[PDB]
Ligand binder design. Structure first.
Ligand code: NI
Lengths: 4, 1091
């Protein structure tokens, strides 16, 4: 968005 | 009385046919109130009476079909089966006694519909007499009876529930023999329309297309015959076939493609017929392009077909004055070319059109040069990747056509330039700013030809719109001075006669330059502001309605670019302009022009003014709500009722099956969407300031989650849900629950039914954000049960679609471009999995351990993502879902460790950095929130994490976030479980991995731990005699990489207190600073001044  | 109500019926029927509205709006009302149970033997007798007027029988038969298509459950049930089976057999007689083929078609439309409602009861049709009628009529040597049978089978294809088992092979016999009926051409044409309607009805049935493949050669022959007799009835059938079920055409596709090319190429046929023939090919390039890509021989021949239609221009005497608003061959071919370049792709299409465009541009015909520039404009979108390389040659050549001896060619050149500025952005702007701006300004000035001067201004708007601010700023003084000059001269001309076409575009062009220039436009504000303000007070006439709206847009975009400070100088005199023009626009109540201009201009004032906009809220909210609530006019007409409403153009109709149709007034659909997007803006900008409107906006928006007519509205409705809860928050949780109550059920239904994937992802993200707004206790047990089923279905579909896409590969027509589409489909399915993880994250974060039993229903599906052979995004997101279970649902999380723990331990070493990051994260939250049950696994995890951190390339742009997360996971192991590690020994290595600066969350966590270590009673981390304290100065110097948020975070103050305490130790301070680069030295100063 980016994340994990 | 029986004979008394029959004689008075003929005059009442003719009364609703008189040309004047006096008796017309008095005889229709008397008819409707009549009992529907008696309207059967009364209206069918007016068609049977062949001695009565032929136009009254046309109306009686059209009125009899409508009473059966619209009303049925009140008229046919509870009526005696003596008159039930009498209207069945009398209707069958009318068709046998009919001499006129016009009436035979009207009464066959009543034979069907009656056949349709009887059959559509359970499945098996209650009218086997209607079935026997077709087999005996198609078999009877009478052309009229044969034609009547084909009309009933075209209107209602499949009047059977048990067709397959036996009546299916007899349908093939019937149509095959009818297409062989040479003695009559209308019987052959009727069976082609029937074959198509039947194949369309039997959609998805791939076994039936394979069996009926033998009918396609005769069907194609029937379009080839009907077309040369002025009949585009069978040609429409083929276009419908190519659109809905193109794979049916696969066996004889070359014959289909060759015929469609022949009809289109044949000059003799009318425009409507040739365009429809092109449409067969154009549709196949969208619906089945993979199949069409194999017949290159035919697509090559279609290119000059479209080009020859594009050069079918009329020499409009007085074109330069009037406004051109589109059915012509020149528009049909051009659009078809764009659509086919997009459909098949620039790899195949550009080579086929390249030399043809050069032969038309380099020709003395004008119509050829115009067609060449419009073909260049059309192919741009679909072939732009292939057109780069020749781009500098194309642009330099097209720029010469602006000085062409024909004004219409100078206009198509404007179009070519403006469209390339959009199709090739921002490469076009970076490569040709000097040449294109200079050439367009010259066309906008030295023309003295309104239309060309206006189009050059329009091309300039396209150019500046996609121009990077970076390279527009040097051209500001030049472009601005030139635009001002043209604005002031075209404003005098508005006063002399009333010419404004160019001035409208100059204003919008200025707005575009201002908007892109942002803060750099303020030195040029005084040069335009009083000129534009003067325009909105001048332009009050209905002719200048667009010129006034465009000036308001320009005005509001100029103040928005310069910012609230610079705008405050002329803000009062300009806010009153809007206030006065709102009552001027509202006192002449309408829809479509100034509406969207005004809405957006007020919203721009709210972004500029912020908290000072509040006073204008009742003046802007009222009108905004009215256009945001427009219920569009929907009609459910039947048959060819898209000819009388074709003149509207905006009234679009979607032809549903079984003769019924659906129509929708597209007027204001974009205005509604604009207003809904504006309500989302007010909610976001104002927050707390919008509470008075939150309830009525919530009441408006909830139903728009189910507004399938316009996606932009649904997205706005979805987006507004958490924003409205965010506004309402200021009134407390009791009002918050009152708002959430309207939303909750509707938001959940939307997730389970939403058709579009991108609109679904906004609804799913929105629902998750509302759960965060006031979680725990925010969900019914019915809602939890519903949501469980919906998420489980969405997970089941994720894997089902994985198998389906695999089966789409391993198909005769599989190519790299179909793989590109399958990868797009996959990307969407993954984004839905991220939103499943999102809805899940907020439920876990808010409900915590409590919700693990509910989650057990999704457990086999979540485990199914973390399987070893699944694609990496599945393993990444399944790990993410388990990370939220560890973080928000521990220590109970451990009961379920048999589902995640061992794969998560193993995955820390995965080839995918996205998988590695999700695994490393889970182990860090395992130490922090997990509890004592994870203790042995924290001792085990450590060397796995250190192996990733310590490997080479661990800090590549590809693997930084995964390595940082591993560093932070090692850190959390140290801080939260120090009995599972010899922290005193790993700390030196840990310190060397610092600082973090890509994962901002983990940069905060690592720095907060580093501060605990430095602040500790016996630091260890400082080194004996502060030897590695100067190294901590280098870690804290980043800093440079915005890791520690200067003010926001508590560690920012903590790190600057640890650093400034050193200042009191002269030698130690200077040692630590003397070994920092001057960029790093400034970063320590920057932190110390702000924390
Ligand atoms: Ni509720």
């Amino acid at each position: 968005f980016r994340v994990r | 009385a029986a004979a008394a109500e029959q004689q008075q019926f003929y005059l009442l029927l003719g009364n609703l046919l008189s040309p004047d509205n006096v008796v017309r709006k008095q005889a229709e009302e008397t008819y409707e109130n009549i009992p529907g149970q008696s309207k059967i033997t009364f209206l069918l007798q007016a068609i049977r009476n062949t001695t009565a007027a032929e136009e009254a029988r046309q109306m009686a038969a059209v009125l009899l079909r409508r009473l059966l298509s619209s009303a049925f459950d009140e008229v046919y049930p509870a009526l005696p089966s003596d008159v039930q089976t009498a209207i069945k057999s009398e209707l069958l007689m009318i068709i046998q006694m009919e001499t006129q083929s016009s009436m035979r078609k009207k009464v066959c439309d009543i034979a069907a519909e009656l056949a349709r409602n009887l059959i559509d009861e359970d499945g098996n049709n209650q009218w086997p007499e209607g079935l026997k009628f077709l087999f005996d009529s198609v078999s009877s040597q009478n052309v009229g009876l044969r034609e009547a049978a084909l009309h009933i089978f075209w209107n209602f294809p499949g009047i059977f529930g048990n067709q397959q088992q036996h009546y299916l092979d007899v349908i093939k016999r019937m149509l095959v023999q009818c297409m062989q009926d040479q003695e009559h051409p209308s019987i052959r044409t009727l069976s082609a329309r029937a074959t198509a309607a039947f194949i369309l009805a039997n959609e998805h049935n791939v076994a039936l297309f394979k069996h009926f493949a033998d009918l396609l050669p005769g069907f194609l022959q029937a379009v080839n015959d009907s077309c040369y007799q002025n009949d585009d009835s069978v040609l429409k059938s083929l276009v419908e076939i190519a659109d809905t079920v193109p794979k049916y055409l696969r066996p004889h596709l070359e014959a289909t493609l060759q015929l469609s090319l022949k009809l289109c190429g044949d000059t003799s046929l009318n425009n409507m017929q040739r365009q429809l023939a092109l449409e067969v090919i154009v549709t196949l390039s969208e619906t089945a392009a993979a199949m069409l890509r194999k017949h290159t021989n035919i697509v090559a021949q279609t290119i000059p077909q479209m080009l020859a239609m594009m050069v079918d221009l009329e020499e409009d005497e007085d074109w330069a004055n009037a406004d051109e608003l589109f059915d012509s061959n020149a528009v049909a071919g051009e659009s078809a070319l764009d659509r086919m370049a997009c459909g098949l792709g620039g790899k195949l299409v550009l080579p086929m059109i390249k030399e043809h465009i050069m032969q038309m541009l380099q020709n003395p015909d004008w119509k050829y040069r115009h067609a060449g520039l419009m073909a260049l404009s059309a192919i741009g979108e679909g072939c732009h990747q292939q057109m780069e390389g020749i781009l500098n040659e194309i642009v330099n050549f097209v720029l010469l056509f602006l000085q062409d001896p024909h004004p219409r060619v100078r206009y198509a050149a404007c179009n070519a330039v403006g469209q390339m500025a959009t199709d090739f952005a921002p490469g076009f702007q970076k490569k040709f700013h000097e040449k294109v701006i200079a050439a367009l300004l010259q066309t906008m000035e030295d023309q003295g030809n309104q239309r060309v001067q206006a189009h050059a201004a329009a091309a300039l708007i396209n150019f500046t719109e996609d121009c990077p601010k970076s390279l527009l700023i040097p051209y500001l003084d030049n472009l601005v001075k030139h635009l001002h000059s043209i604005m002031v001269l075209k404003l005098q001309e508005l006063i002399q006669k009333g010419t404004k076409l160019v001035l409208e575009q100059v204003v919008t062009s200025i707005a575009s330059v201002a908007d892109t220039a942002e803060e750099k436009f303020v030195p040029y504000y005084d040069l335009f502001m009083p000129s534009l303000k003067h325009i909105v007070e001048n332009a009050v006439q209905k002719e200048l309605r667009l010129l006034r709206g465009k000036t308001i847009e320009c005005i509001s975009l100029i103040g928005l670019a310069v910012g609230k400070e610079k705008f405050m100088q002329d803000a009062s005199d300009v806010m009153q302009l809007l206030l006065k023009t709102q009552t001027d626009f509202n006192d002449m109540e309408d829809d479509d022009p100034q509406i969207s201009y005004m809405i957006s201009a007020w919203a721009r004032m709210c972004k500029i003014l912020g908290k000072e906009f509040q006073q204008y809220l009742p003046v802007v909210m009222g009108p905004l709500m009215k256009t945001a609530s427009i219920k569009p006019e929907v009609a459910l007409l039947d048959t060819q009722d898209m000819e009388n409403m074709s003149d509207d153009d905006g009234w679009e109709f979607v032809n549903l099956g079984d003769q019924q149709s659906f129509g929708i007034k597209t007027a204001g659909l974009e205005e509604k969407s604009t207003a809904c997007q504006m309500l989302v803006c007010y909610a976001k900008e104002l927050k707390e300031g919008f509470v008075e409107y939150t309830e009525q906006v919530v009441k408006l928006m909830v139903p728009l989650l189910k507004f399938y007519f316009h996606d932009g509205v649904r997205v706005a409705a979805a987006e507004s849900m958490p924003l409205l809860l965010e506004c309402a928050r200021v009134r407390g949780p009791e009002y918050l629950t009152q708002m959430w109550h309207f939303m909750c059920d509707a938001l959940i239904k939307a997730i389970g039914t939403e058709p579009d994937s991108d609109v679904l992802s906004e609804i799913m993200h929105s629902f998750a954000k509302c759960i965060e707004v006031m979680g725990d206790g925010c969900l019914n047990n019915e809602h939890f049960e519903e949501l469980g089923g919906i998420l489980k279905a969405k997970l089941e579909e994720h894997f089902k679609n994985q198998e389906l896409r695999q089966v789409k590969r391993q198909d005769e027509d599989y190519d790299e471009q179909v793989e590109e589409s399958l990868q797009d489909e996959d990307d969407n399915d993954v984004y839905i999995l991220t939103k499943v993880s999102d809805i899940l994250h907020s439920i876990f974060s808010s409900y915590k351990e409590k919700v693990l039993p509910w989650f057990e229903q999704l457990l086999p599906l979540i485990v199914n993502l973390i399987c070893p052979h699944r694609p990496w995004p599945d393993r990444q997101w399944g790990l993410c879902i388990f990370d939220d279970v560890i973080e928000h649902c521990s220590p109970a999380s451990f009961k379920y460790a048999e589902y995640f723990l061992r794969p998560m331990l193993q995955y820390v070493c995965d080839n995918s950095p996205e998988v590695r990051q999700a695994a490393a994260y889970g182990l860090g939250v395992m130490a922090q929130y997990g509890g004592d049950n994870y203790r042995p696994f924290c001792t085990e995890a450590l060397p796995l994490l250190v192996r990733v951190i310590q490997s080479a390339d661990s800090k590549t742009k590809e693997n930084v976030n995964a390595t940082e997360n591993c560093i932070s996971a090692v850190g959390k192991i140290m801080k939260f479980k120090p009995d599972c590690v010899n922290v005193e020994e790993v700390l030196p290595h840990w310190l060397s991995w610092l600082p973090l600066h890509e994962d901002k969350e983990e940069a905060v966590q690592t720095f907060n731990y580093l501060c605990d270590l430095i602040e500790s009673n016996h630091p260890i981390v400082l080194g004996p005699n502060n030897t590695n304290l100067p190294k901590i100065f280098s870690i804290i110097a980043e800093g440079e990489m915005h890791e520690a948020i200067k003010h926001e975070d508590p560690c920012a103050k903590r790190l600057a207190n640890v650093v400034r305490q050193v200042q009191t130790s002269g030698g130690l301070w200077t040692e630590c600073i003397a070994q920092l680069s001057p960029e790093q030295q400034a970063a320590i100063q920057e932190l110390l001044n702000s924390a």
